[PDB]
Tab-separated table of C-alpha atoms in Angstrom:
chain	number	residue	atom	x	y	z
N	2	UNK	CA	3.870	0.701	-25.419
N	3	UNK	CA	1.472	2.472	-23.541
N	4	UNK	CA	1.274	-0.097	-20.897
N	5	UNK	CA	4.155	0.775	-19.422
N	6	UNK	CA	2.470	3.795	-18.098
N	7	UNK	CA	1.647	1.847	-15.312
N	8	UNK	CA	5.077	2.143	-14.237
N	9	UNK	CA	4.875	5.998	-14.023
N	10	UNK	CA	2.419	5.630	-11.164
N	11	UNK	CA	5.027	4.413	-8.808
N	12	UNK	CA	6.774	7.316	-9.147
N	13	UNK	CA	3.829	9.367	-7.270
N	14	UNK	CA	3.981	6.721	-4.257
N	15	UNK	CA	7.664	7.347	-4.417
N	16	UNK	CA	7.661	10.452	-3.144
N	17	UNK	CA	5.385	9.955	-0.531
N	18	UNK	CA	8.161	7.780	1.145
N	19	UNK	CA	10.538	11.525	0.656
């Protein structure tokens, strides 16, 4: 279920909030 992946991503504009 590579789609998913997308998912990932919001972990990089996550920490841009921290």
């Amino acid at each position: 279920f590579p789609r998913i992946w997308l998912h990932n991503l919001g972990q990089h504009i996550y920490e841009t909030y921290g």
